[PDB]
Amino acid sequence: TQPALLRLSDHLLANYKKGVRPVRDWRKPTTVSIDVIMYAILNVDEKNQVLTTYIWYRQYWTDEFLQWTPEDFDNVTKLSIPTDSIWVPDILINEFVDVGKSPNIPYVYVHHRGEVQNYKPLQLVTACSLDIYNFPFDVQNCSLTFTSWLHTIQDINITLWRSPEEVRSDKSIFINQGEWELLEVFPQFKEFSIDISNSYAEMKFYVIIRRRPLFYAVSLLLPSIFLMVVDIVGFCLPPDSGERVSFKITLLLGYSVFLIIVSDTLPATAIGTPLIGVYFVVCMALLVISLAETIFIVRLVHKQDLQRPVPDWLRHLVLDRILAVRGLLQELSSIRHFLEKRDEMREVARDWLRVGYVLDRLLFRIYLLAVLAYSITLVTLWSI
Amino acid sequence: TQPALLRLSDHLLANYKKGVRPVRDWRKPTTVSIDVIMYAILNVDEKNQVLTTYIWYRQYWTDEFLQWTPEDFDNVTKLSIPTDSIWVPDILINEFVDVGKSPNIPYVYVHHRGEVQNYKPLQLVTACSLDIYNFPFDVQNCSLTFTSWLHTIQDINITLWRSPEEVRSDKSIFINQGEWELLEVFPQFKEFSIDISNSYAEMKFYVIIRRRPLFYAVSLLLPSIFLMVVDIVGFCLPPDSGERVSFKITLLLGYSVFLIIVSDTLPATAIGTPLIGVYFVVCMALLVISLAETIFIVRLVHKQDLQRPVPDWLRHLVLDRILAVRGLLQELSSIRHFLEKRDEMREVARDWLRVGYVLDRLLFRIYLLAVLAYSITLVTLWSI
Amino acid sequence: TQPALLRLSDHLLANYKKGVRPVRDWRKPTTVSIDVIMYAILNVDEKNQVLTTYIWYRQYWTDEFLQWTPEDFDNVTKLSIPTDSIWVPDILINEFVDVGKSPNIPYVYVHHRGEVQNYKPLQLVTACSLDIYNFPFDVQNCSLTFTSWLHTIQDINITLWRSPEEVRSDKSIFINQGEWELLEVFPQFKEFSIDISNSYAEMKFYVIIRRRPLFYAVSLLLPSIFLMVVDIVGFCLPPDSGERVSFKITLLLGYSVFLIIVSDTLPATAIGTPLIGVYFVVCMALLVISLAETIFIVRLVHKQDLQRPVPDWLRHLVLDRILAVRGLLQELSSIRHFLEKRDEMREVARDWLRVGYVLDRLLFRIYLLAVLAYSITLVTLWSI
Amino acid sequence: TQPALLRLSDHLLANYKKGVRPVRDWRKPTTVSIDVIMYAILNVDEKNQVLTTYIWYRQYWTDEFLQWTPEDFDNVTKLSIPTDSIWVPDILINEFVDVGKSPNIPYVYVHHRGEVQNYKPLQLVTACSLDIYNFPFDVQNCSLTFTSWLHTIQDINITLWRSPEEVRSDKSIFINQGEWELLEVFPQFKEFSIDISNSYAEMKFYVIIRRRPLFYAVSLLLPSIFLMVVDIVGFCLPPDSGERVSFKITLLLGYSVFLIIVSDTLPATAIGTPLIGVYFVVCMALLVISLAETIFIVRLVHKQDLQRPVPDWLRHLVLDRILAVRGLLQELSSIRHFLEKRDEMREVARDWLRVGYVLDRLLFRIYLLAVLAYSITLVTLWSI
Amino acid sequence: TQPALLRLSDHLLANYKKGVRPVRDWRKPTTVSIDVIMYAILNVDEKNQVLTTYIWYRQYWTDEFLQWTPEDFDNVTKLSIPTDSIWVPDILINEFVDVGKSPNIPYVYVHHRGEVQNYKPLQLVTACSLDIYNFPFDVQNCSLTFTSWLHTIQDINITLWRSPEEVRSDKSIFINQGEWELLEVFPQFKEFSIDISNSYAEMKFYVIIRRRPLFYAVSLLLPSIFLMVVDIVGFCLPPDSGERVSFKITLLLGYSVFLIIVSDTLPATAIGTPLIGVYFVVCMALLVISLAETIFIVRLVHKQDLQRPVPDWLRHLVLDRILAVRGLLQELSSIRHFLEKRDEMREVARDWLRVGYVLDRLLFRIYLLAVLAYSITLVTLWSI
Ligand SMILES: O=C1c2cccc3c2[C@H](CCC3)CN1[C@@H]1CN2CCC1CC2
Ligand SMILES: O=C1c2cccc3c2[C@H](CCC3)CN1[C@@H]1CN2CCC1CC2
The missing domain is CATH 2.70.170.10 (Neurotransmitter-gated ion-channel ligand-binding domain)
Known part of the structure; x- marks a missing residue:
């Protein structure tokens, strides 16, 4: 029951x-x-x-x-x-x-x-x-x-x-x-x-x-590509404009602050560092090399009033790989000498500026080739 | 009981x-x-x-x-x-x-x-x-x-x-x-x-x-509109002033730091990214295009002392779519030749600067039309 | 017991x-x-x-x-x-x-x-x-x-x-x-x-x-007052100095980073935004108006070598509201013509610069009056 | 048992x-x-x-x-x-x-x-x-x-x-x-x-x-001293160099970002603010006064082509407290008049620049004395 | 049982x-x-x-x-x-x-x-x-x-x-x-x-x-080395270019923001501070010394129109350790005097600029030696 x-x-x-x-x-x-x-x-x-x-x-x-x-x-x-x-x-x-x-x-x-x-x-x-x-x-x-x-x-x-x-x-x-x-x-x-x-x-x-990995693509690959693009864009400024140095240093400052901001989400162990840090420092080294090239080209084309004529070997290589009447007379001769000195200094400056322009174009082409090689290598290593 | x-x-x-x-x-x-x-x-x-x-x-x-x-x-x-x-x-x-x-x-x-x-x-x-x-x-x-x-x-x-x-x-x-x-x-x-x-x-x-969505309006739409407004404001600086490049690069730096600051409140899943990232990168691409146009116009109007006269086809298109006495004599002739060389170089620079001004106005109008089209498209997609 | x-x-x-x-x-x-x-x-x-x-x-x-x-x-x-x-x-x-x-x-x-x-x-x-x-x-x-x-x-x-x-x-x-x-x-x-x-x-x-409210006074009112003060201080730079634009854009960048930093402590609900955002965007709009005025004044006084003489109506309004001997002769006449062309261009530039100076002083006084009105209105709304 | x-x-x-x-x-x-x-x-x-x-x-x-x-x-x-x-x-x-x-x-x-x-x-x-x-x-x-x-x-x-x-x-x-x-x-x-x-x-x-208090010394006193030192260092730039304004505004931006970064570790109660905020705003006011002095000195020495000769009272005070032949003749006279006008404008600019240099040195000495007084007062208040 | x-x-x-x-x-x-x-x-x-x-x-x-x-x-x-x-x-x-x-x-x-x-x-x-x-x-x-x-x-x-x-x-x-x-x-x-x-x-x-310690190497040693490298790179800019001061001040701003960002991960006790702060402030002092040297060299080579000829002791030390006819006549003499005054001022400026260049090279070599000494001392103290 x-x-x-x-x-x-x-x-x-x-x-x-x-x-x-x-x-x-x-x-x-x-x-x-x-x-x-x-x-x-x-x-x-x-x-x-x-x-x-x-x-x-x-x-x-x-x-x-x-x-x-x-x-x-x-x-x-x-x-x-x-x-x-x-x-x-x-x-x-x-x-x-x-x-x-x-x-x-x-x-x-x-x-x-x-x-x-x-x-x-x-x-x-x-x-x-x-x-x-x-x-x-x-x-x-x-x-x-x-x-x-x-x-x-x-x-x-x-x-x-x-x-x-x-x-x-x-x-x-x-x-x-x-x-x-x-x-x-x-x-x-x-x-x-x-x-x-x-x-x-x-x-x-x-x-x-x-x-x-797609969780971090938009956060790791986008800013680096954007900064490399604006770098190759700013590489077209005239070297004697006096703004290319400011452009490059502002770009490097931006890349540095981006690096130190994104380094927090990037993990780290006491035994070793991830392999992406090597690629990041290679990109920043490319940016520093661009800055150094800009500084060199600026140092070449600057009109310093101490400029001596460009040497002939450099010229060849670069530019082929690319009485009251007598008193009046002497016064006019002095005036003409002043004007001729000014014109000669201007001509020397022009020659140096042309040499610098040629070298800048050559180095820009080299840098573009290197950037494309590095990008295609990264793309292949991602796609394998 | x-x-x-x-x-x-x-x-x-x-x-x-x-x-x-x-x-x-x-x-x-x-x-x-x-x-x-x-x-x-x-x-x-x-x-x-x-x-x-x-x-x-x-x-x-x-x-x-x-x-x-x-x-x-x-x-x-x-x-x-x-x-x-x-x-x-x-x-x-x-x-x-x-x-x-x-x-x-x-x-x-x-x-x-x-x-x-x-x-x-x-x-x-x-x-x-x-x-x-x-x-x-x-x-x-x-x-x-x-x-x-x-x-x-x-x-x-x-x-x-x-x-x-x-x-x-x-x-x-x-x-x-x-x-x-x-x-x-x-x-x-x-x-x-x-x-x-x-x-x-x-x-x-x-x-x-x-x-x-109004929780994020004041945090997502306001800075982009403000930066686009200050961009179209700074687009009115004279191209030969030597400050337009600094203005544009400072604006791009500000937009970049704003982007990397607001990307934290923006969520992210490992399967996909929200559709607002596309509009943000389109806005940053518009800013980069403005920077590139500024750099091009600066490269055109710069007085480099290597400037050759503007070609006739470009001129047409742009500017229509817009003895002691003999010794004294030869000294005066040399002085006049110096002055004439200077004046001719200045005239060539002036012609190039006018061509650059016309092209800058044309490209500014085009950029303004494109910005207005993008804004009205965004407004319609929000209002539907 | x-x-x-x-x-x-x-x-x-x-x-x-x-x-x-x-x-x-x-x-x-x-x-x-x-x-x-x-x-x-x-x-x-x-x-x-x-x-x-x-x-x-x-x-x-x-x-x-x-x-x-x-x-x-x-x-x-x-x-x-x-x-x-x-x-x-x-x-x-x-x-x-x-x-x-x-x-x-x-x-x-x-x-x-x-x-x-x-x-x-x-x-x-x-x-x-x-x-x-x-x-x-x-x-x-x-x-x-x-x-x-x-x-x-x-x-x-x-x-x-x-x-x-x-x-x-x-x-x-x-x-x-x-x-x-x-x-x-x-x-x-x-x-x-x-x-x-x-x-x-x-x-x-x-x-x-x-x-x-005194918990947030030192964190909300101090930076805005400081930035408005440094703005009215920098408003006294000469417009043709080539640094006023950099000053204004750096100030706007600083105000933007301050805004996006302090917007975190500022709360936000999905139904509405506090009334302080309106005053903040009004202050940033005042800063943007100052930047636009600076850009306009810079565009006026710039020596572009394309400057035509200032129109008479604008002039009135602004500036009242404020043989071997014959060969020698023709060579000297050509030299004098070159010098006179240079002097005439300089005089036109001077007239434009004076007009720009007058307009800059007028707009600075107007901006100062507007800032004082906005400040006294805010003070009264706080004190009521 | x-x-x-x-x-x-x-x-x-x-x-x-x-x-x-x-x-x-x-x-x-x-x-x-x-x-x-x-x-x-x-x-x-x-x-x-x-x-x-x-x-x-x-x-x-x-x-x-x-x-x-x-x-x-x-x-x-x-x-x-x-x-x-x-x-x-x-x-x-x-x-x-x-x-x-x-x-x-x-x-x-x-x-x-x-x-x-x-x-x-x-x-x-x-x-x-x-x-x-x-x-x-x-x-x-x-x-x-x-x-x-x-x-x-x-x-x-x-x-x-x-x-x-x-x-x-x-x-x-x-x-x-x-x-x-x-x-x-x-x-x-x-x-x-x-x-x-x-x-x-x-x-x-x-x-x-x-x-x-030594927990916060390295975090509160070091950046202010460093910024005051770099300020008194940059105070030695020539006023007509066109970089002193950029230097001062960059320094003020850095001080502002440091202030708004360190204001977070600084506590705050709704009843009152600590006494260190007064000293911080006094330091920032000193920096703003330095910026205003730089702007004034720049406004003095600028070559604006509108410069009138320096008044005699200011000069005293500052600089003591511190026919074919007739046709040829008239053409030469016109050339000489052009050159003399240019030379007179240059001389007026030179006089104004010298006055500005003297005033800049005087104000720099005054600012250095004020900074030393403020520093020794702070040191004594810490050491008592 | x-x-x-x-x-x-x-x-x-x-x-x-x-x-x-x-x-x-x-x-x-x-x-x-x-x-x-x-x-x-x-x-x-x-x-x-x-x-x-x-x-x-x-x-x-x-x-x-x-x-x-x-x-x-x-x-x-x-x-x-x-x-x-x-x-x-x-x-x-x-x-x-x-x-x-x-x-x-x-x-x-x-x-x-x-x-x-x-x-x-x-x-x-x-x-x-x-x-x-x-x-x-x-x-x-x-x-x-x-x-x-x-x-x-x-x-x-x-x-x-x-x-x-x-x-x-x-x-x-x-x-x-x-x-x-x-x-x-x-x-x-x-x-x-x-x-x-x-x-x-x-x-x-x-x-x-x-x-x-390798947990903090990539976070402490890399940015300092990068900034010292870009500093010694920028040290090669011409002193009269008007961009070296901007370069140095931007570098100092970047180093300051890096310092105040990394000072958070750096621990701190109320009894004492780690020994790495001494090395960090020594590096920042080296940067400030570089800035001061740049400012001094800029102050030397600047063309101020107040420049007097370089003293002979400094010259030795530095540059060795490195009638209608009469009316026409007097008019031509006045023109020649104007031109000669201009040429003499330019020559004085050139002499000062050469002295500044020599001193800049000497100080750059000294700074490089000091940096290498400090780096090798740090490397030895790490390797012992
Ligand atoms: O739990 C609940 C609850 C849970 C699920 C469904 C429903 C309810 C009632 C309301 C009816 C529908 C409210 N409540 C509470 C319980 N107590 C009495 C009324 C409410 C307040 C206290
Ligand atoms: O809980 C309470 C409390 C709660 C709600 C109302 C009131 C009280 C008393 C005070 C009277 C009104 C205080 N207390 C405490 C309890 N204990 C004895 C006195 C206080 C301290 C310890």
Whole structure:
């Protein structure tokens, strides 16, 4: 006349101790099977070398104290028991560095032969060793080691619920619209021993993830291209205009402030720097070379009033690779000498300015070729 | 002589087990009805793809162990029972990524036929997939899936307390002065099965929200308009003044620093970039074209002392589309030749400067027409 | 021979149920009186529309199960009982969006007729609708609604312990050295009904606060005044010096970077923008007008070698509102003609420069008058 | 035959009620002695007016229900009892605004006459009123008020364990390498009464701390000195070089960006601003005066072709405080007149430039004297 | 017929008190052995002087109430007991300033002679005194003091489980890819006494860590080298070009903004500043000296029309260490005098410009030598 569930709960949970490992022969370990499904990757901190994920975790073990015959209890083959009323193994990850706030599941399933099932979502704060050598295109290899913190392998052994193929090829619920992309989850069993007669069992899950580089394209490639374009645009100013130096120094200031602003989002580890810093400093070196060429050309064509005539070797190479009446007379001769001195100085300045113009055009063509070579090399290395 | 409430509490909560599903026949599921009301949208994080809301949640189910006759207990038809004294279903959202700090409601209502009522406010930290293609005007479509985490559909089935129309058209308490605007909450029932004989029941609520674009108008449209205005103002400087290049390069530096400052508040997802980046780079391309035109006009009108007379075709097109006495004599002739050379060089420079002025006016008119076309196109696309 | 307190505790807390509403007749509600005192305003977030306060809260109700005669228990008229041993009503605020960490008070006072007293400090995280139209001088009007989350008005009714005058005029412990100033706390009772036969009681407290504007004076008024001063200082540079344009563009760049830096501390709501943005854009428009006037005056006085003589109407208005011997002869005449051409061009340039100087002085006086008018209008609007 | 500790624990904790104030005569209060030792000052927030400290707190009271004779229990004079098994007073600070995460001490000492001892470390989040008028050198005066939150003075009275001298002169464990320096902790007892017959006891501890100014020397004094030095360096540029104005405006831009960058680390309260802002605006006013002097000197020495001869009073003061033959003849006379006009204009320009040079040297000496006076005044005010 | 584990649990945990120190003779202390292994260093905050680590902690003590004979209980020599069922000592660190979220280990091992084992991971928030005098290369010396917070040395004494050599030379699990490198963990025992007859036992662990300097190389050495390079590049501009001053002032502005940007990542303590600030201000002083030299050379070579001939001593040193006919006649003489005056002024300007060029080359060579000396000194101090 009982509801056939109160009867079973009173038959099971009475005279039951939740501190004893549920075995009738203490020489047998409780094999705890484990299954893990990745759901989301909340935050990957490259500075502190931590990893915040969120998984759906579930275990199975045999409780030799929760067993009954269904025909006695109205063919009841399973029921739900509160989690704080039975023995639960202490399986937790070795690579913890904090505690994740996870919802509390208060019930567990129990079958008529002792098979307990415990579904529980977990938020993991794992200390992973991150390598950012190829920053925009890197494949991180983090590990999760499920082990019993106190019991040896003669008490709790850890197996896998599903086959390793199904665990590796499972992306059914992963939030894929984020920054990271899940490649696989590779499980592996290992008997880790600290001493003799003290061997622990553990199950390592290798979470292999890959970053999406288009998150940083608009933030890394656009300003450099824009600055190189405005540089090759400003390279067409006349060298004697007195504004090319200001243009180049303002451009270098802008590139410097952009570099020191974007260096914050760029991660950094104490072991090494990403390979993009080399390309950034190569671009800034190209800008500095452009500035130095501008300064040299300005130093050439400047009218300093100390200019001597251009040497003949340089001329060849560059410009082929490109009485009262007597008193009146002497006064007029002095005036003509003054005017001729002025005209000769102007002609020397003109010759120097033409030489400078030719050299500037040559160096501009060389710089353009070098920039195009560097750009096509970068494009090929991106496209391979 | 008892207070008629102590009697009922002792009659109900004695011999009561809070771990057993309250059914007299285990072949019947406990239908849990659900009602949800949105109250506030605390934070929408487009970077980590999370959503923090705050709802008012309430459920109803039938407890076949809490039943009495009112006439026996002084016509008491309902009372309040502590929540930790009865069976509560484990209904929680599938899309959790954290735990929200919510107040604890310690009591529940119970009627004389078993109908339990459980009001409880919840703070949800939900992993939603956000699409920001149309950033200032986007309609996000997030989902909340209420399901039983352990019980199958033969134990706990989920229904709706109100009709779907009332759930869709309910905005009675929503905090509307924020950044997001609630459009509707659309419920839908689905029997989600992982395997055969293992089918779970769930209730999906589609929270459809829309961002208010005036939050970002004063921060996105004002600086671009101001910079375009000062650009068309500075376009009136004389090209031979030697300050137009400095003006344009300072303006481009200011636009660049504004761009890299405002790019932080602009969100970004690893799948795509918003459509406002295209308009921003089009504006910066217009600025770069203005700079290039200024540089070209400066290169034309510069007095380089190497200037040859302007060709006749260009002239036509542009400027129509717009003895002691003999010794004294030869000395005076040399002086006159010097002066005539100077005057001829000045005249050539004047002709080139006039050609440059005409071309500058033409290109300024063209640039103004292009800017007005782009502005009216943007205004129409905003106003449609 | 007992300590006369153990006796009373055993007489009261034995056969006592902490889940039953303490009434002998279930047709009577437990009138819970409420008193609230503001202590501090921790943080007002205008972006997320939340409000973090800290109050001293206390309630009073009648427990008909905790009653005794003092003469029996050695004239004991009151004692302290742990809070987890009696019935406590579930009074909490409707406008919660989080949980505040508040100290736990473990004891309550009980008198010999059932009057229980429960002092408890609370930290509130309340969702308030903030209006920042007059940002530096605004009077926020936030609300706190104390209501029973589950019980109707036939079970728990809410009254006020003190008179509304004393609750409105109480600032005894408020931390007044902060940014916000408390004006009053106005209570109001309302019977809020969702349906028929389901009416809830609630008590609304309107916390009316006012911001102190001197917190932002040194951060908002000082840079604008400094920039206007340096602008009217730089307005005295000669227009033909070739540095006035650089001065004005550097000043505009500085004002722009200051604007985009201070726009972060300036709050913003999706419904509207504060009225200070209008004054800021008016100041930046004044700066842009100064830049345009400088550009115009520079365009006037520039020596372009294309300058024609100033028209007579403009002149009037502005400048009144302010043989071998024959061969020698012809050679000397040609020289004199060259010199006369140069002198005539210089004279035309001088006339244009004088006209430009006069117009610059006139426009500078006009701009100074306009700036003084705008400043005195702002001062009057602040002082009223 | 018992371990002589199980016996005593069963003799004490049996028939013991942890909710009753441990007195045999309810007309006697439980005098709780208090001792406090500062350990660290974690964070002082001048914006929100909070203070986060960490103290070592300990109390002593007499429990008249925990008493025994040592000779009966094998000369046991003291033992440890779990804290959740006895009565603990509710002593907490009045100035709380949050809850501090502190370790939990599970045991307390009890002597054979009832003296209980309760050591416990506490993290305090206290609302302190901060005065930052003298920001780099300020002595904050914060208060901690230990009082019983519910019990009046007839139930719990608060005394001091050590003498006030030892509490004032105790710096044994204070972390001294931080930013703040502890001066003293001054205790004071006060009987605070809200009404008649309702008087509470409290113990106020005045934590008097002092900031170390060398934390901000390298961040406040270095850039101002550097900018003043580069200003007095750039003051030596020739006034007619056309670069002094650019130098001064770039320097003012740099000082402005430094000011608006360092104004963030500078705290600010709604009641007043620190006294360092006055010195900062005095320095910026000196820079603006230098800019105005440069502009004036530039306006003096500029060659505008409108220059009239320098007036004689200014000259005195400044420069003492520092036929075919007839046709040929008339043509030569016209040429000589042109040349003489040019030479006269050049001579007038030279005179004006010399006057400007003299005035510039005089004003530079005056500015240097003023800067040295201001610097020595600041040094003396720092050194007193 | 019992499972031989339920029997042992009922034999042990029945009649067991978890509040009594497990000794049969109260005159014997419970020697608690301790072992500590560092696992990760999460965050070192130099501003607030805190240290966040994560260790693997384990203790051992003898429980004289948990003892049995294996042959009686089926040769069971050990089992797991819940932690909340036995007596656990209150060993915690003295240098706490917060509470670290650590996983909860619910079981402990117990042998058949009372040896209990308690493994537990801990997250420590320790107040450490940090010295950053040699910021990029510093060896921090932090301390962890494990002591019993309440029990004296006659109740709980603390020993070491492993030998001090094994504790010092253990780096088996340390996360080494981070910013800090673990050198050793040196334990030391000390009997700390506050009074007479009140002596406590404690165990100090000196965690000695060292920072990796390559984390800050790319952020500290690169911009300074780049700016020095562009400075020595710009040092080649002609001094009379009128752009060298603009170049130098723009470079100084860039260096200043870089300095004030990187000064944030540079830590700072109230006791002293790191030694890198001296080198940074030496570099900025070199830049200021370059600016002053540029200003001096510009002041020398400027054509001011007030230039007097260069003195002979300076010349030697520098330039060796490097009637109608009569009317026509007088008119021609006046013209020649004008031209000769102009030519003489030009010649004086040329002489001054040559002197300035020579001095500029000399000072540039001196500055280059000084820069190379400073760079090689820095390189040697880094390489030693
Ligand atoms: O929980 C809820 C709630 C949740 C879900 C749906 C609905 C509600 C009611 C309103 C009806 C629809 C309001 N509430 C509150 C609970 N208490 C009584 C009325 C409200 C304020 C306090
Ligand atoms: O809670 C409260 C409180 C709350 C609401 C209203 C009022 C109060 C009293 C003052 C009277 C009005 C102060 N308090 C404190 C509680 N204890 C005794 C006096 C105060 C300090 C400790």
